[PDB]
Coordinates of C-alpha atoms and ligand atoms in Angstrom, one line a residue:
Chain A
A1 CA 8.5 55.2 -41.9
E2 CA 6.5 57.1 -44.4
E3 CA 5.6 60.7 -44.0
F4 CA 2.7 60.5 -46.4
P5 CA 0.5 57.5 -47.5
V6 CA 1.7 55.8 -50.6
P7 CA -1.2 55.3 -53.2
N8 CA -2.0 51.5 -53.8
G9 CA 0.3 49.9 -56.2
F10 CA 3.1 52.4 -55.7
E11 CA 6.4 51.9 -53.9
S12 CA 8.3 54.3 -51.6
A13 CA 12.0 53.8 -52.2
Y14 CA 15.4 55.5 -52.1
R15 CA 18.2 56.1 -54.5
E16 CA 21.7 57.4 -53.8
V17 CA 22.7 59.9 -56.4
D18 CA 26.1 61.6 -56.3
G19 CA 26.3 60.8 -52.5
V20 CA 22.7 62.0 -51.6
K21 CA 20.0 59.7 -50.8
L22 CA 16.8 60.8 -52.6
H23 CA 13.3 59.6 -51.7
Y24 CA 10.8 58.9 -54.4
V25 CA 7.4 57.2 -54.9
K26 CA 7.1 55.1 -58.1
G27 CA 4.5 53.1 -60.0
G28 CA 3.0 52.2 -63.3
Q29 CA 4.6 50.8 -66.6
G30 CA 5.7 52.5 -69.8
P31 CA 7.7 55.7 -70.6
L32 CA 8.9 57.5 -67.6
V33 CA 7.3 60.8 -66.4
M34 CA 9.0 62.5 -63.4
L35 CA 6.9 64.9 -61.2
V36 CA 8.8 67.4 -59.2
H37 CA 7.0 69.2 -56.3
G38 CA 7.6 72.7 -54.9
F39 CA 8.0 74.7 -51.6
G40 CA 6.0 73.7 -48.6
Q41 CA 5.1 70.3 -50.1
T42 CA 6.6 67.0 -51.0
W43 CA 6.0 64.2 -53.6
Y44 CA 2.6 64.0 -52.0
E45 CA 1.0 66.9 -53.8
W46 CA 1.0 64.6 -56.9
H47 CA -0.7 61.7 -55.2
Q48 CA -4.0 62.1 -56.9
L49 CA -2.5 62.5 -60.4
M50 CA -0.2 59.6 -60.0
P51 CA -2.6 56.7 -60.3
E52 CA -4.1 58.1 -63.4
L53 CA -0.8 58.7 -65.1
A54 CA 0.5 55.3 -64.1
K55 CA -2.2 53.6 -66.3
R56 CA 0.0 54.7 -69.3
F57 CA 3.5 55.7 -67.8
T58 CA 6.0 54.7 -65.3
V59 CA 5.6 57.6 -62.8
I60 CA 8.3 58.8 -60.4
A61 CA 7.8 61.5 -57.8
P62 CA 11.0 62.5 -55.9
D63 CA 11.4 64.6 -52.8
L64 CA 13.6 67.6 -53.5
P65 CA 17.0 67.4 -51.8
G66 CA 16.5 68.2 -48.1
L67 CA 12.7 68.1 -48.3
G68 CA 10.3 65.3 -47.6
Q69 CA 12.5 62.2 -47.0
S70 CA 15.4 63.3 -49.2
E71 CA 18.8 64.2 -47.8
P72 CA 20.1 67.6 -48.4
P73 CA 22.2 68.3 -51.5
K74 CA 26.0 68.0 -51.1
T75 CA 26.9 70.5 -53.7
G76 CA 24.4 73.3 -53.2
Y77 CA 20.8 74.6 -53.8
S78 CA 21.2 76.5 -57.0
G79 CA 19.1 75.4 -59.9
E80 CA 22.0 73.9 -61.9
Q81 CA 23.3 72.0 -58.9
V82 CA 20.0 70.4 -57.9
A83 CA 19.2 69.7 -61.5
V84 CA 22.1 67.2 -61.7
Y85 CA 20.5 65.1 -58.9
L86 CA 17.0 65.1 -60.5
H87 CA 18.5 64.3 -64.0
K88 CA 20.6 61.5 -62.9
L89 CA 17.7 60.0 -60.8
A90 CA 15.4 60.0 -63.8
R91 CA 18.0 58.6 -66.2
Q92 CA 18.6 55.6 -63.8
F93 CA 15.1 54.6 -64.6
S94 CA 15.0 55.7 -68.2
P95 CA 18.7 55.3 -69.4
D96 CA 18.0 54.8 -73.1
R97 CA 14.7 56.9 -73.7
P98 CA 13.7 60.4 -73.2
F99 CA 11.4 61.0 -70.3
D100 CA 8.6 63.5 -69.5
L101 CA 8.8 66.2 -66.7
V102 CA 6.1 67.9 -64.7
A103 CA 7.2 70.5 -62.3
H104 CA 5.5 72.9 -59.9
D105 CA 6.9 76.0 -58.1
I106 CA 10.6 75.7 -57.2
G107 CA 10.5 72.3 -59.0
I108 CA 10.8 74.5 -62.1
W109 CA 13.9 76.2 -60.8
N110 CA 15.5 72.8 -59.9
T111 CA 14.8 71.2 -63.4
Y112 CA 15.1 74.0 -65.9
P113 CA 18.9 73.7 -66.2
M114 CA 19.0 69.9 -66.8
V115 CA 16.2 70.4 -69.4
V116 CA 18.1 72.9 -71.4
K117 CA 21.5 71.1 -71.0
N118 CA 20.0 67.7 -71.9
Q119 CA 17.2 68.5 -74.4
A120 CA 17.3 65.2 -76.1
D121 CA 16.5 63.5 -72.7
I122 CA 13.2 65.4 -72.2
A123 CA 10.3 64.3 -74.4
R124 CA 7.6 66.5 -73.1
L125 CA 7.7 69.3 -70.5
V126 CA 4.9 70.7 -68.2
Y127 CA 5.7 73.7 -65.9
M128 CA 3.2 75.3 -63.6
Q129 CA 3.2 78.2 -61.1
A130 CA 6.7 79.6 -60.9
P131 CA 8.8 81.9 -62.8
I132 CA 11.9 80.6 -64.4
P133 CA 14.6 82.4 -62.4
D134 CA 15.8 85.4 -64.5
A135 CA 15.9 89.1 -64.4
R136 CA 12.1 89.5 -64.5
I137 CA 12.0 88.5 -60.8
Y138 CA 13.8 91.8 -59.8
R139 CA 10.8 93.8 -61.0
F140 CA 8.0 91.9 -59.2
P141 CA 6.6 94.4 -56.7
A142 CA 6.9 93.9 -52.9
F143 CA 3.6 95.4 -52.0
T144 CA 0.2 95.5 -53.9
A145 CA -2.8 97.7 -53.9
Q146 CA -5.1 94.6 -53.9
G147 CA -4.6 91.1 -52.7
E148 CA -1.0 90.4 -51.6
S149 CA 2.5 90.2 -53.3
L150 CA 3.0 86.9 -54.4
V151 CA 6.7 87.3 -54.2
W152 CA 7.7 89.1 -50.9
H153 CA 8.6 85.6 -49.4
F154 CA 11.6 85.6 -51.9
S155 CA 13.2 88.2 -49.6
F156 CA 12.0 86.8 -46.2
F157 CA 13.3 83.3 -47.2
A158 CA 16.7 84.7 -48.5
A159 CA 17.3 87.0 -45.6
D160 CA 20.6 86.3 -43.9
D161 CA 21.4 85.3 -40.3
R162 CA 18.9 82.4 -40.6
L163 CA 16.0 84.9 -40.1
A164 CA 13.3 82.7 -41.4
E165 CA 14.3 79.5 -39.6
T166 CA 14.8 81.5 -36.4
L167 CA 11.3 83.0 -36.6
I168 CA 9.5 80.0 -38.0
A169 CA 11.1 77.1 -35.8
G170 CA 8.3 76.0 -33.4
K171 CA 5.6 77.7 -35.5
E172 CA 6.0 75.7 -38.6
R173 CA 2.3 74.4 -38.6
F174 CA 0.9 77.9 -38.2
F175 CA 3.2 79.3 -40.9
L176 CA 2.5 76.6 -43.3
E177 CA -1.3 77.0 -43.0
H178 CA -0.9 80.8 -43.5
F179 CA 1.2 80.7 -46.6
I180 CA -0.7 77.9 -48.3
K181 CA -4.0 79.5 -47.9
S182 CA -2.7 83.1 -48.5
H183 CA -1.6 81.7 -52.0
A184 CA -4.9 79.7 -52.7
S185 CA -8.2 80.5 -54.3
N186 CA -10.0 77.2 -53.2
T187 CA -8.8 77.2 -49.6
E188 CA -11.2 74.6 -48.5
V189 CA -9.1 71.7 -49.9
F190 CA -6.5 72.4 -47.2
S191 CA -8.1 70.5 -44.3
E192 CA -6.3 70.6 -41.0
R193 CA -5.4 67.0 -41.5
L194 CA -3.6 67.6 -44.8
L195 CA -2.0 70.7 -43.3
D196 CA -0.7 68.5 -40.4
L197 CA 0.9 66.1 -42.9
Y198 CA 2.8 68.7 -44.7
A199 CA 3.9 70.8 -41.7
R200 CA 5.2 67.6 -39.9
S201 CA 7.5 67.0 -42.9
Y202 CA 9.0 70.5 -43.3
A203 CA 9.4 71.1 -39.6
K204 CA 12.3 68.6 -39.6
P205 CA 15.1 71.1 -38.9
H206 CA 17.1 70.1 -41.9
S207 CA 13.9 70.4 -44.1
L208 CA 13.1 73.9 -42.7
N209 CA 16.6 75.0 -43.5
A210 CA 16.8 73.3 -46.9
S211 CA 13.4 75.1 -47.8
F212 CA 15.0 78.5 -47.4
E213 CA 18.4 77.6 -48.9
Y214 CA 16.6 77.3 -52.3
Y215 CA 15.8 81.0 -52.0
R216 CA 19.3 81.8 -50.8
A217 CA 20.6 80.5 -54.0
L218 CA 18.1 82.2 -56.1
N219 CA 20.3 85.0 -57.4
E220 CA 22.9 82.4 -58.2
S221 CA 20.3 80.5 -60.2
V222 CA 19.4 83.7 -62.1
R223 CA 23.1 84.2 -63.0
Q224 CA 23.2 80.5 -64.2
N225 CA 20.1 80.8 -66.3
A226 CA 21.3 84.1 -68.1
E227 CA 23.9 81.8 -69.8
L228 CA 21.7 78.7 -70.2
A229 CA 18.8 80.7 -71.8
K230 CA 20.9 81.4 -74.9
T231 CA 19.5 78.1 -76.2
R232 CA 15.7 78.0 -76.5
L233 CA 13.9 74.7 -75.5
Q234 CA 12.8 72.7 -78.5
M235 CA 10.5 70.0 -77.0
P236 CA 6.8 70.3 -76.7
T237 CA 5.9 72.4 -73.6
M238 CA 2.7 73.2 -71.7
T239 CA 2.3 75.8 -69.0
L240 CA -0.4 75.8 -66.4
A241 CA -1.2 78.8 -64.0
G242 CA -4.0 79.6 -61.7
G243 CA -6.3 82.4 -62.6
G244 CA -7.4 83.0 -59.1
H245 CA -6.0 84.3 -55.9
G246 CA -2.3 83.2 -55.7
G247 CA -2.3 82.4 -59.4
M248 CA 0.3 83.7 -61.9
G249 CA -2.3 84.3 -64.6
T250 CA -0.8 85.0 -68.0
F251 CA 2.8 85.5 -66.7
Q252 CA 3.5 81.8 -66.9
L253 CA 2.9 81.5 -70.6
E254 CA 4.2 84.9 -71.5
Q255 CA 7.7 84.1 -69.9
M256 CA 7.8 80.7 -71.2
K257 CA 7.4 81.9 -74.8
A258 CA 10.9 83.6 -74.4
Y259 CA 12.2 80.2 -73.4
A260 CA 10.4 77.7 -75.7
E261 CA 9.8 77.5 -79.4
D262 CA 6.7 75.0 -78.9
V263 CA 4.5 76.1 -75.9
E264 CA 0.8 76.1 -75.1
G265 CA -0.5 77.6 -71.9
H266 CA -3.5 77.4 -69.8
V267 CA -4.9 79.7 -67.0
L268 CA -7.2 77.8 -64.7
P269 CA -10.1 80.1 -63.5
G270 CA -10.9 80.0 -59.8
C271 CA -7.6 78.3 -58.9
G272 CA -4.7 79.7 -57.0
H273 CA -1.1 78.4 -56.6
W274 CA -1.8 74.9 -55.5
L275 CA -3.3 73.5 -58.7
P276 CA -3.1 69.6 -58.0
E277 CA -5.1 70.1 -54.9
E278 CA -7.3 73.2 -55.6
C279 CA -8.2 72.1 -59.1
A280 CA -7.5 68.4 -59.3
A281 CA -10.0 67.5 -62.0
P282 CA -9.1 70.0 -64.7
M283 CA -5.3 70.1 -64.0
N284 CA -5.1 66.3 -64.1
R285 CA -6.9 66.2 -67.4
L286 CA -4.8 68.8 -68.9
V287 CA -1.6 67.0 -67.9
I288 CA -2.8 63.5 -68.9
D289 CA -3.9 64.7 -72.2
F290 CA -0.9 66.7 -73.0
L291 CA 1.5 63.8 -72.1
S292 CA -0.7 61.3 -73.9
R293 CA 0.0 62.9 -77.3
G294 CA 2.5 60.2 -78.6
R295 CA 3.7 57.0 -77.2
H296 CA 2.6 56.0 -73.7
Chain B
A1 CA 9.0 103.7 -14.9
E2 CA 10.4 105.4 -18.1
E3 CA 11.3 103.1 -21.0
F4 CA 14.2 105.4 -22.0
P5 CA 16.2 107.9 -20.1
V6 CA 14.9 111.5 -20.3
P7 CA 17.6 114.2 -21.0
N8 CA 18.2 116.9 -18.6
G9 CA 15.9 119.8 -18.8
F10 CA 13.1 117.7 -20.4
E11 CA 10.1 116.2 -18.8
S12 CA 8.2 112.9 -19.6
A13 CA 4.5 113.7 -19.5
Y14 CA 1.2 112.6 -20.9
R15 CA -1.8 114.3 -22.5
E16 CA -5.3 112.9 -23.3
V17 CA -6.2 113.4 -26.9
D18 CA -9.7 112.1 -28.0
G19 CA -9.7 109.7 -25.2
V20 CA -6.2 108.3 -25.9
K21 CA -3.4 109.0 -23.4
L22 CA -0.4 110.0 -25.4
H23 CA 3.1 110.0 -23.9
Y24 CA 5.7 112.6 -24.9
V25 CA 9.0 114.2 -23.9
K26 CA 9.1 118.0 -23.8
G27 CA 11.6 120.7 -23.2
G28 CA 12.9 124.1 -24.3
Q29 CA 11.3 127.5 -24.9
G30 CA 10.2 129.3 -28.1
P31 CA 8.1 128.2 -31.0
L32 CA 7.0 124.5 -30.9
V33 CA 8.9 121.8 -33.0
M34 CA 7.3 118.2 -33.0
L35 CA 9.6 115.3 -33.8
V36 CA 7.7 112.1 -34.7
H37 CA 9.5 108.8 -34.7
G38 CA 9.1 105.7 -36.8
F39 CA 8.8 101.9 -36.7
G40 CA 11.0 100.0 -34.4
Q41 CA 11.6 103.1 -32.2
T42 CA 10.1 105.7 -29.9
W43 CA 10.6 109.3 -29.0
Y44 CA 14.1 108.3 -27.9
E45 CA 15.5 108.3 -31.4
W46 CA 15.4 112.1 -31.2
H47 CA 17.2 112.3 -27.8
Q48 CA 20.4 113.7 -29.3
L49 CA 18.6 116.2 -31.5
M50 CA 16.3 117.5 -28.7
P51 CA 18.7 119.4 -26.4
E52 CA 20.3 121.2 -29.4
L53 CA 16.9 122.2 -30.7
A54 CA 15.8 123.2 -27.2
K55 CA 18.3 126.1 -27.3
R56 CA 15.9 127.9 -29.8
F57 CA 12.6 126.1 -29.7
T58 CA 10.0 124.3 -27.5
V59 CA 10.6 120.6 -28.5
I60 CA 8.0 117.9 -28.1
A61 CA 8.6 114.2 -29.1
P62 CA 5.5 112.0 -28.7
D63 CA 5.3 108.2 -28.9
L64 CA 3.1 107.2 -31.7
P65 CA -0.3 105.7 -30.6
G66 CA 0.2 102.1 -29.4
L67 CA 4.1 102.5 -29.3
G68 CA 6.4 103.5 -26.6
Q69 CA 4.2 104.6 -23.6
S70 CA 1.4 105.9 -25.7
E71 CA -2.1 104.2 -25.6
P72 CA -3.4 102.6 -28.8
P73 CA -5.7 104.7 -31.0
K74 CA -9.4 104.4 -30.4
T75 CA -10.3 105.2 -34.1
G76 CA -7.7 103.3 -36.2
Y77 CA -4.2 103.2 -37.5
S78 CA -4.6 104.8 -40.9
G79 CA -2.6 108.0 -41.5
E80 CA -5.7 110.2 -41.5
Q81 CA -6.8 108.8 -38.1
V82 CA -3.4 108.8 -36.5
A83 CA -2.7 112.3 -37.8
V84 CA -5.7 113.7 -35.8
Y85 CA -4.1 112.7 -32.5
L86 CA -0.7 114.3 -33.5
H87 CA -2.3 117.5 -34.8
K88 CA -4.4 117.9 -31.7
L89 CA -1.5 117.2 -29.3
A90 CA 0.6 119.8 -31.0
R91 CA -2.2 122.3 -30.9
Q92 CA -2.5 121.9 -27.1
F93 CA 1.0 123.4 -26.9
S94 CA 1.0 125.8 -29.9
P95 CA -2.6 126.9 -30.2
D96 CA -1.8 130.5 -31.5
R97 CA 1.1 130.1 -34.0
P98 CA 2.2 127.4 -36.6
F99 CA 4.6 124.7 -35.5
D100 CA 7.4 122.9 -37.1
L101 CA 7.2 119.2 -37.9
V102 CA 10.1 116.7 -38.2
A103 CA 9.2 113.1 -39.1
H104 CA 11.0 109.8 -39.7
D105 CA 9.8 106.5 -41.4
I106 CA 6.1 105.9 -40.6
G107 CA 6.1 109.3 -38.7
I108 CA 5.5 110.6 -42.2
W109 CA 2.6 108.4 -42.9
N110 CA 1.1 109.5 -39.6
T111 CA 1.5 113.3 -40.2
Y112 CA 1.2 113.9 -43.9
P113 CA -2.7 114.2 -43.7
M114 CA -2.8 116.7 -41.0
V115 CA 0.0 118.8 -42.7
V116 CA -1.8 119.0 -46.0
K117 CA -5.3 119.6 -44.2
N118 CA -4.0 122.2 -41.8
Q119 CA -1.4 124.1 -43.7
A120 CA -1.7 127.3 -41.8
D121 CA -0.6 125.3 -38.7
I122 CA 2.7 124.0 -40.2
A123 CA 5.6 126.6 -40.3
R124 CA 8.3 124.3 -41.7
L125 CA 8.4 120.6 -42.5
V126 CA 11.2 118.0 -42.4
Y127 CA 10.6 114.6 -43.7
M128 CA 13.2 111.8 -43.7
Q129 CA 13.5 108.2 -44.8
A130 CA 10.0 107.0 -45.9
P131 CA 7.7 107.4 -48.9
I132 CA 4.6 109.3 -48.5
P133 CA 2.0 106.5 -49.0
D134 CA 0.9 106.7 -52.7
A135 CA 0.9 104.6 -55.8
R136 CA 4.7 104.8 -56.1
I137 CA 5.0 102.2 -53.3
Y138 CA 3.4 99.6 -55.6
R139 CA 6.5 99.6 -57.8
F140 CA 9.2 98.9 -55.1
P141 CA 10.6 95.5 -56.1
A142 CA 10.1 92.6 -53.7
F143 CA 13.6 91.0 -54.3
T144 CA 17.0 92.4 -55.5
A145 CA 19.9 90.9 -57.3
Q146 CA 21.8 91.4 -53.9
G147 CA 19.3 89.5 -51.9
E148 CA 16.5 90.9 -49.6
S149 CA 15.0 94.2 -50.5
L150 CA 14.4 97.2 -48.2
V151 CA 10.5 97.0 -48.7
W152 CA 9.4 93.4 -48.3
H153 CA 8.6 94.2 -44.7
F154 CA 5.5 96.1 -46.0
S155 CA 4.0 92.8 -46.9
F156 CA 5.3 90.8 -43.8
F157 CA 3.8 93.4 -41.5
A158 CA 0.5 93.8 -43.4
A159 CA -0.3 90.1 -43.6
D160 CA -3.3 88.8 -41.6
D161 CA -3.5 85.9 -39.2
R162 CA -1.2 88.1 -37.0
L163 CA 1.6 86.7 -39.0
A164 CA 4.2 89.1 -37.8
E165 CA 3.2 89.1 -34.1
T166 CA 3.0 85.3 -34.1
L167 CA 6.4 84.8 -35.7
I168 CA 8.2 87.6 -33.8
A169 CA 6.9 86.8 -30.3
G170 CA 9.7 85.4 -28.2
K171 CA 12.3 86.7 -30.8
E172 CA 11.6 90.4 -30.5
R173 CA 15.2 91.3 -29.7
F174 CA 16.6 89.1 -32.4
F175 CA 14.3 90.4 -34.9
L176 CA 14.8 94.1 -34.0
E177 CA 18.6 93.7 -34.3
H178 CA 18.1 92.1 -37.7
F179 CA 15.9 94.8 -39.2
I180 CA 18.0 97.7 -37.6
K181 CA 21.2 96.2 -39.3
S182 CA 19.5 95.2 -42.5
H183 CA 18.4 98.9 -42.9
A184 CA 21.7 100.5 -41.6
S185 CA 25.0 101.6 -43.0
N186 CA 26.6 102.3 -39.5
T187 CA 25.7 99.5 -37.2
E188 CA 28.3 100.5 -34.5
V189 CA 25.9 103.3 -33.2
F190 CA 23.5 100.6 -31.9
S191 CA 24.9 99.4 -28.6
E192 CA 23.6 96.2 -26.9
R193 CA 21.9 98.5 -24.3
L194 CA 20.2 100.6 -26.9
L195 CA 18.9 97.6 -28.8
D196 CA 17.8 96.1 -25.5
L197 CA 15.7 99.3 -24.7
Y198 CA 14.1 99.5 -28.2
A199 CA 13.2 95.8 -28.1
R200 CA 11.7 95.8 -24.6
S201 CA 9.5 98.7 -25.7
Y202 CA 8.0 97.2 -28.9
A203 CA 7.8 93.7 -27.4
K204 CA 4.9 94.9 -25.1
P205 CA 2.1 92.9 -26.7
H206 CA 0.0 95.9 -27.5
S207 CA 3.0 97.6 -29.0
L208 CA 4.1 94.7 -31.1
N209 CA 0.6 94.6 -32.6
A210 CA 0.4 98.4 -32.9
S211 CA 3.7 98.3 -34.8
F212 CA 2.1 96.2 -37.5
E213 CA -1.3 97.8 -37.6
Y214 CA 0.3 100.8 -39.2
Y215 CA 1.1 98.5 -42.1
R216 CA -2.2 96.8 -42.1
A217 CA -3.7 100.2 -42.7
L218 CA -1.2 101.2 -45.4
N219 CA -3.4 100.6 -48.4
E220 CA -6.1 102.6 -46.8
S221 CA -3.6 105.4 -46.2
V222 CA -2.6 105.3 -49.8
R223 CA -6.4 105.5 -50.8
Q224 CA -6.8 108.4 -48.4
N225 CA -3.8 110.4 -49.7
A226 CA -5.0 110.0 -53.3
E227 CA -7.7 112.6 -52.4
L228 CA -5.6 114.7 -50.0
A229 CA -2.7 115.1 -52.5
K230 CA -5.0 117.3 -54.7
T231 CA -3.7 120.1 -52.5
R232 CA 0.0 120.8 -52.7
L233 CA 2.0 121.8 -49.8
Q234 CA 3.1 125.3 -49.6
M235 CA 5.3 125.6 -46.5
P236 CA 9.2 125.4 -46.7
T237 CA 10.0 121.8 -46.7
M238 CA 13.4 119.8 -46.5
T239 CA 13.8 116.1 -47.1
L240 CA 16.8 114.0 -45.8
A241 CA 17.8 110.6 -47.0
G242 CA 20.7 108.2 -46.5
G243 CA 22.9 107.5 -49.5
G244 CA 24.4 104.3 -48.1
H245 CA 22.8 100.9 -47.5
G246 CA 19.4 101.2 -46.2
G247 CA 19.0 104.8 -47.5
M248 CA 16.4 106.0 -49.9
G249 CA 18.7 108.0 -52.0
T250 CA 17.1 110.4 -54.4
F251 CA 13.6 108.9 -54.0
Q252 CA 12.8 111.2 -51.1
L253 CA 13.3 114.4 -52.6
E254 CA 12.0 113.3 -56.0
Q255 CA 8.7 112.1 -54.5
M256 CA 8.4 115.3 -52.3
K257 CA 8.8 117.5 -55.4
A258 CA 5.4 116.3 -56.4
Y259 CA 3.9 117.2 -53.2
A260 CA 5.6 120.4 -52.2
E261 CA 6.2 123.8 -54.1
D262 CA 9.1 124.8 -52.0
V263 CA 11.4 121.8 -51.1
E264 CA 15.1 121.3 -50.6
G265 CA 16.8 117.8 -50.3
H266 CA 19.9 116.3 -49.1
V267 CA 21.3 112.7 -49.5
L268 CA 23.8 111.8 -46.8
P269 CA 26.6 109.5 -48.1
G270 CA 27.7 106.9 -45.8
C271 CA 24.3 106.8 -44.0
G272 CA 21.4 104.4 -44.1
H273 CA 17.9 104.6 -42.7
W274 CA 18.4 105.4 -39.0
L275 CA 19.7 108.9 -39.7
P276 CA 19.3 110.4 -36.1
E277 CA 21.5 107.6 -34.7
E278 CA 23.7 106.6 -37.8
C279 CA 24.5 110.1 -38.7
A280 CA 23.5 112.2 -35.8
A281 CA 25.8 115.2 -36.1
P282 CA 25.2 116.1 -39.8
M283 CA 21.5 115.3 -39.6
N284 CA 21.1 117.5 -36.5
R285 CA 23.0 120.3 -38.2
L286 CA 20.8 120.1 -41.3
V287 CA 17.6 120.1 -39.3
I288 CA 18.7 122.9 -36.9
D289 CA 19.9 125.1 -39.7
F290 CA 16.7 124.5 -41.8
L291 CA 14.5 125.3 -38.9
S292 CA 16.5 128.3 -37.6
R293 CA 16.4 130.4 -40.9
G294 CA 14.9 133.6 -39.4
Ligands
LIG1 C1 6.7 79.0 -54.6 C2 5.5 79.8 -54.0 C3 4.8 78.9 -53.0 C4 4.5 79.4 -51.8 C5 4.9 80.7 -51.2 C6 5.2 80.7 -49.8 C7 7.7 79.8 -55.3 O1 8.5 80.3 -54.3 C8 7.2 80.9 -56.1 C9 6.3 80.6 -57.2 C10 5.3 81.3 -57.7 C11 5.0 82.7 -57.2 C12 6.1 83.6 -57.6 C13 6.0 84.5 -58.7 C14 4.9 85.2 -59.2 C15 5.2 85.6 -60.7 C16 4.7 86.8 -61.2 C17 3.5 87.4 -60.8 C18 3.7 88.6 -60.0 C19 2.6 89.2 -59.1 C20 3.0 89.8 -57.9 O2 2.1 89.7 -56.9 O3 4.1 90.3 -57.6
LIG2 C1 10.2 102.2 -42.0 C2 11.3 101.2 -42.3 C3 11.9 100.8 -40.9 C4 12.3 99.5 -40.7 C5 12.3 98.4 -41.7 C6 11.7 97.1 -40.9 C7 9.1 102.2 -43.1 O1 8.4 101.1 -43.0 C8 9.8 102.1 -44.4 C9 10.6 103.5 -44.7 C10 11.8 103.6 -45.5 C11 12.4 102.3 -46.2 C12 11.6 101.8 -47.4 C13 11.3 102.5 -48.4 C14 12.4 102.6 -49.5 C15 11.7 103.4 -50.6 C16 12.3 103.5 -51.9 C17 13.6 103.1 -52.2 C18 13.9 103.1 -53.6 C19 13.7 101.8 -54.3 C20 13.1 101.9 -55.7 O2 12.7 100.8 -56.2 O3 13.1 103.0 -56.3

């Protein structure tokens, strides 16, 4: 069974990593690029970018542990713990060469530790629409004069006594449409049909819980990154952020400059959080061009 | 059928104010003190303070519009709109002399405009455990190094699509116990029976919605207060805040200093948000003494 349709010429497969069965979709030939999705979604957010990248790269798009068709992690949900699974997965397909990494939302949280601890394995890095977990997240406001706070869900999802699962169970499709559209500029791309697909996946009880455990581990991830950030990232890095409703604007590049020696950033006007879907043409072009500098 | 038991010597009654039928509980004799409850609760949070105050004052404790047994407002849920109802209700019982005001949580939001606009009507003022809506609320962090913050509910409750009503329906008792205890230092004061009573009250569909409409109007209340705050408050004021988990600490008095010329403050160590219940005896003492000077 497949939760989302595989693009023509790709395969849906699984790989056991440290006792955890990870789902991924893979296609193409050449150097490896791994695309890592975020909260509320799965590998499928990349399905329009994947065929274009596969003309020059081997492309792998895993489901995060516990999400999509991937089993939950056995160690835990902190960034350093999850990053082990993703690093070992990528290295099974690229054991002797560095690979490229593209990550969105909590995909950033779940990859930053393995990037900084295995810098020689990462050729080029693209991060979009999430803060790297650090002390800056403790200053983001809970309530805004205009629009809506992009970050209050951190506390909702991290609340104890399984508050979020208890309130959202049975209402997953309603909740997902609300939080996707509230973080979007171009809401019209989220058709009822596409929302149905995403909601069906994260309504699996272990996936609903897994989704929130990433936030329950956020303070631990911050503590982990306080140590890791003592070494700046050396590989070429690109940041993308939306400039519209739900977009992080200039914050994405400004924070990355504290982490990376070689970084360029873009703010995409009229685009919110969900860049691959809201602004597919400019986002895909930016990613393909950036990764195509060099061997592919 | 009363939602909460009325103390001896008090009456549960109703008055029509601008076409809205307000519920209140009233007892005592002497100058008027109005006690205004906050989110998650009703007049009943004052039921231990009321008989003590009723020894020296006429005491009235209304249900906020749409909450408890009060009808929803017919104008709106912004602080300036709701404060009209509470001002006119108090004036029905104290038309000829100023009255005292005690408010908790969003009771503050719903009374500050009528205090600043009718200062000759307010003898003494007691505010506990809520910011006056102003630009300071836009700095409160969403997330803390210990986990969930005390303020993320601002955005949960203000969200559209009836987000809060839709997620909380069928889980009202569960959710109320959660936010009571996440804002409490002393949870042992909340019996299963008391949580049952509060949950049954705000689970009424129009009351669950009314609860969150106060937050959907919060930015409008901030904008309203930006003009009202040009006039400082002159009456004697006291602030109270908890010093424990759920408490606002020094924020309550420090904010009030920008609004009030004559203000004293206390922070109650070992107490959280729900001061009339978590720390009833010292809270009551401080309110009674402050109002009884003279
Ligand atoms: C994924 C968010 C996706 C869906 C939310 C239900 C991650 O949980 C968060 C990624 C990005 C948004 C968080 C940080 C915003 C960063 C700084 C800008 C602050 C503005 C503000 O409104 O506070
Ligand atoms: C009622 C809260 C009741 C139940 C919560 C579901 C009001 O909605 C909020 C009133 C008080 C609690 C929130 C405000 C805290 C204010 C500042 C604390 C200081 C933090 C800081 O950043 O300085």
